[PDB]
Design a protein around this ligand. Structure first.
Ligand SMILES: *[C@@H]1O[C@H](CO)[C@@H](O[C@@H]2O[C@H](CO)[C@@H](O[C@@H]3O[C@H](CO)[C@@H](O)[C@H](O[C@H]4O[C@H](CO[C@H]5O[C@H](CO)[C@@H](O)[C@H](O)[C@@H]5O)[C@@H](O)[C@H](O)[C@@H]4O)[C@@H]3O)[C@H](O)[C@H]2NC(C)=O)[C@H](O)[C@H]1NC(C)=O
Ligand SMILES: C[C@H]1O[C@H](O[C@H]2[C@H](O)[C@@H](O)[C@@H](O[C@H]3[C@H](O)[C@@H](O)[C@@H](O)O[C@@H]3CO)O[C@@H]2CO)[C@H](O)[C@@H](O)[C@@H]1N[C@H]1C=C(CO)[C@@H](O)[C@H](O)[C@H]1O
Ligand SMILES: *[C@@H]1O[C@H](CO)[C@@H](O[C@@H]2O[C@H](CO)[C@@H](O)[C@H](O)[C@H]2NC(C)=O)[C@H](O)[C@H]1NC(C)=O
Ligand SMILES: *[C@@H]1O[C@H](CO)[C@@H](O[C@@H]2O[C@H](CO)[C@@H](O)[C@H](O)[C@H]2NC(C)=O)[C@H](O)[C@H]1NC(C)=O
Ligand SMILES: *[C@@H]1O[C@H](CO)[C@@H](O[C@@H]2O[C@H](CO)[C@@H](O)[C@H](O)[C@H]2NC(C)=O)[C@H](O)[C@H]1NC(C)=O
Ligand SMILES: *[C@@H]1O[C@H](CO)[C@@H](O[C@@H]2O[C@H](CO)[C@@H](O)[C@H](O)[C@H]2NC(C)=O)[C@H](O)[C@H]1NC(C)=O
Ligand SMILES: *[C@@H]1O[C@H](CO)[C@@H](O)[C@H](O)[C@H]1NC(C)=O
Ligand SMILES: *[C@@H]1O[C@H](CO)[C@@H](O)[C@H](O)[C@H]1NC(C)=O
Length: 586
């Protein structure tokens, strides 16, 4: 059946994703160490960059795939732990890492892990959640499989910063997952709820204090505001002229998936009534929008895009969203079987009447095979198959999943070999089988208070250190090269200043200059010093001497201010202003 030709595409998708990940990635030449590229397409659209969302979302698949079957994925997982451990410290246009921990929200870096200076929709506030959720789903396996040390000592201090970010900044606005609307997004809030609830449980079992986990009830309280009568508005707290119907909604449910949960829960699961009623109106608008969905019935899946007002490269359906729309049904079908009950609410009745004509407002219970409960279950999973069916049509023969496939003609376009779309296909294919990840602890989640309160506890941000080894003394240090004309020996002189990095007026901790390009023509000593930005550093060169002779300072103290964070790599040009004393002979 179709089961064969999606099992083959899953295997292609593994390589498609893995080839985009450095260092040993076939698709990406350049830059490695555990940084996942979204797409190798350097040609427009230029997607040759690492997105902290895409990186953390595709690696969540890799970890969950690693849990069942593949063990060679451990190599790329453990480089990612090193990668993001470093990436944390990288000062970027959103902000620096230390003082308030603002730089973690920056969505996009170079395939290196150097800053992306260009203009962008920042901050995005969801990467920290997905990166926490990724590392928490790996570290909670390590504690279960007799490697507690790694989870506690090295992986945790990465997570500690990322859910400190969520604790401190959930209630301030950001950009949505589509990098467009500067507003409180549903996908961003629902995933960063999970990062506190699941993060609190791992903090408990590791035996450490999660700063930021406090806000889990208040984040869940605010998540109730997104619902809107018939459907769920994805971006709340702005007016951008959009409906609110958005793939954002589906992608939030599938990425915050739990099997032990019931549809009663206020975390808004795939099987929850309001989420089903959204899926109806959301998929029905795309059923009517695109020419591809010309007269497809109400009981059959269709090409799903991101929103009705989408204009990005035509306003098309997306591969990752159309697969996630199937996964949404495969999540819901599993949850009803898991909890053995279907309380079909009148708010969610419009969903079921398409799939099963003779539904009511009953509590359908897990009875016989061929009973009504099983018939609804077998119809919903059949409805899920039609979403992957129409996906299989517009997926090409060689299996190259792009970002989008065209609105009208259905041929592929946009970024070629998108890592998300491969991962989203794998996440879907897992859920077709019984391969569900784990209970992140939705039942143990603290329910929302009586009234919501605007709040955010200020978390603290220590470097990962054990994972990746930056260890930052202070925020955004800029490079500055001292050069000095000093006539002396052609090889084998120091520099001190009022700053701590230089010395603070002592010659034991003074920085030694190298005589690399010293010549008769140009007697240059030099030293590239990474020291703090925005400081009027008062420096002075000094000469160390042979046969235990004392040090010889220059006659005057120089001062030149090092420029502010975010570039301007200055190089000073001084000469020796004082007497070069007596040389040695001993
Ligand atoms: C930080 O957290 C705090 C809470 O901890 C957040 O504060 C809450 O923000 C909510 C969203 O702005 C707000 O909800 C609305 O409150 C007003 C009254 O102030 C209600 O009238 C609204 O209900 C009505 O509208 C909804 C949706 O219908 C449409 O209309 C609204 C605009 O009115 C649109 O936003 C929406 O897109 C829809 O098109 C209906 O479903 C209702 O039936 C009703 O008609 C909302 O509930 C909370 O009141 C507010 N709470 C407090 C205590 O301040 C804060 O926003 C958050 N900030 C960030 C950045 O995350
Ligand atoms: C890849 C991204 O492209 C689109 O958005 C970005 C634009 O391409 C850029 O031009 C830039 O826009 C800024 C203007 O240049 C600047 O003049 C100023 O007005 O600010 C603008 C931004 O506010 O940055 C845009 C992003 O903010 C497109 O709208 C967006 O959806 C695209 N993102 C997708 C790509 C990936 C790849 O990993 C996914 O992470 C996202 O979910 C996708 O939505
Ligand atoms: C487990 O992961 C490995 C990658 O580490 C997969 O290996 C690829 O398998 C395909 C099979 O068609 C080959 O064509 C590739 O050449 C393999 N690549 C490498 C680098 O080994 C493997 O298929 C995965 N297995 C399962 C069961 O998921
Ligand atoms: C696999 O199929 C994809 C379908 O996208 C091929 O990508 C196209 O490659 C050609 C090369 O000339 C480009 O002109 C097209 O623009 C690409 N497609 C898109 C959507 O941009 C890919 O080359 C194929 N790989 C093979 C046959 O090895
Ligand atoms: C990271 O660097 C700082 C200094 O920039 C180190 O801080 C010292 O920590 C030790 C205890 O481990 C204290 O006794 C010192 O007083 C601290 N300050 C200084 C200025 O030395 C810190 O230990 C480093 N961390 C790692 C893991 O190497
Ligand atoms: C340090 O020595 C270098 C020697 O090159 C000086 O740089 C030269 O300065 C002269 C000024 O007459 C220029 O004509 C040359 O083109 C410069 N050469 C280079 C390589 O820069 C420099 O000015 C000296 N600095 C101080 C502070 O005395
Ligand atoms: C270095 O000296 C300058 C003199 O203007 C001063 O402003 C600055 O604060 C000093 N920095 C120190 C002592 O770290
Ligand atoms: C200037 O340098 C001398 C070196 O001995 C030092 O003692 C003095 O404190 C410095 N003064 C300033 C203002 O930098």
């Amino acid at each position: 059946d179709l089961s064969s030709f999606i099992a083959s595409e899953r295997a292609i998708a593994l390589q498609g994703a893995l080839n985009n990940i450095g260092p040993d990635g076939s698709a990406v030449p350049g830059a490695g160490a555990g940084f996942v590229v979204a797409s190798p397409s350097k040609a427009n659209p230029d997607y040759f960059y690492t997105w902290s969302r895409d990186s953390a979302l595709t690696l969540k698949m890799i970890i969950d795939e690693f849990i069942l079957g593949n063990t060679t994925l451990q190599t790329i997982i453990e480089q990612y732990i090193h990668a993001q451990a470093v990436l944390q410290t990288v000062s970027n246009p959103s902000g620096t890492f230390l003082p308030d921990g603002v730089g973690l929200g920056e969505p996009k870096f170079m395939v290196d892990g150097t800053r992306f200076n260009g203009p962008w929709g920042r901050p995005q506030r969801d990467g920290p959640a997905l990166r926490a959720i990724a590392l928490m789903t790996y570290s909670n396996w390590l504690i279960k499989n007799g490697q507690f040390a790694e989870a506690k000592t090295k992986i945790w201090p990465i997570i500690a910063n990322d859910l400190s970010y969520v604790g401190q900044y959930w209630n301030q606005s950001g950009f949505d997952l589509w990098e467009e609307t500067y507003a409180s997004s549903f996908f961003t809030i629902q995933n960063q709820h999970r990062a506190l609830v699941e993060g609190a449980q791992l903090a408990h079992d590791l035996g450490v204090t999660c700063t930021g986990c406090d806000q889990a009830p208040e984040v869940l309280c605010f998540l109730q505001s997104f619902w809107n009568g018939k459907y769920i508005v994805s971006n709340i707290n702005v007016n951008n002229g959009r409906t609110g119907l958005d793939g954002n909604s589906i992608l939030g449910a599938i990425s915050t998936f739990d099997i032990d949960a019931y549809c009663d829960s206020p975390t808004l699961q795939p099987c929850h009534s309001q989420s089903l009623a959204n899926f109806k109106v959301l998929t029905d608008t795309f059923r009517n929008l695109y020419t591809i969905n010309a007269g497809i019935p109400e009981g059959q899946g269709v090409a799903v895009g991101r929103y009705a007002e989408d204009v990005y490269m035509g306003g098309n359906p997306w591969y990752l969203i159309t697969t996630a729309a199937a996964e949404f049904l495969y999540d819901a079908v599993a949850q009803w079987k898991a909890r053995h009950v279907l309380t079909v609410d009148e708010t969610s009745l419009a969903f079921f009447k398409d799939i099963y004509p003779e539904v009511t407002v009953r509590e359908y219970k897990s009875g016989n095979a061929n009973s009504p409960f099983a018939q609804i279950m077998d119809a919903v999973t059949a409805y899920a198959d039609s979403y992957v069916a129409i996906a299989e049509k517009y997926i090409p023969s060689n299996g190259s999943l792009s970002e989008q496939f065209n609105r009208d003609t259905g041929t592929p376009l946009s970024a070629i070999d998108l890592t998300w779309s491969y991962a989203a296909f794998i996440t879907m294919s897992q859920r077709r089988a019984g391969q569900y990840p784990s209970s992140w602890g939705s039942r143990n989640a603290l329910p929302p208070p009586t009234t919501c309160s605007a709040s955010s506890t200020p978390g603290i941000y220590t470097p990962a250190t054990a994972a990746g080894a930056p260890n930052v003394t202070s925020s955004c240090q800029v490079s500055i090269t001292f050069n000095i004309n000093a006539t002396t020996y052609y090889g084998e002189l120091y520099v001190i200043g009022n700053s701590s990095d230089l010395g603070a007026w002592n010659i034991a901790d003074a920085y030694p200059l190298s005589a690399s390009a010293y010549t008769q023509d140009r007697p240059l000593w030099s030293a590239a010093i990474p020291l703090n930005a925005g400081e009027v550093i008062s420096y002075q060169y000094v000469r160390q001497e042979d046969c235990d002779q004392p040090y010889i300072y220059e006659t005057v103290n120089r001062t030149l201010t090092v420029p502010a964070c975010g570039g301007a790599a200055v190089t000073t040009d001084d000469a020796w202003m004082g007497p070069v004393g007596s040389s040695g002979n001993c």
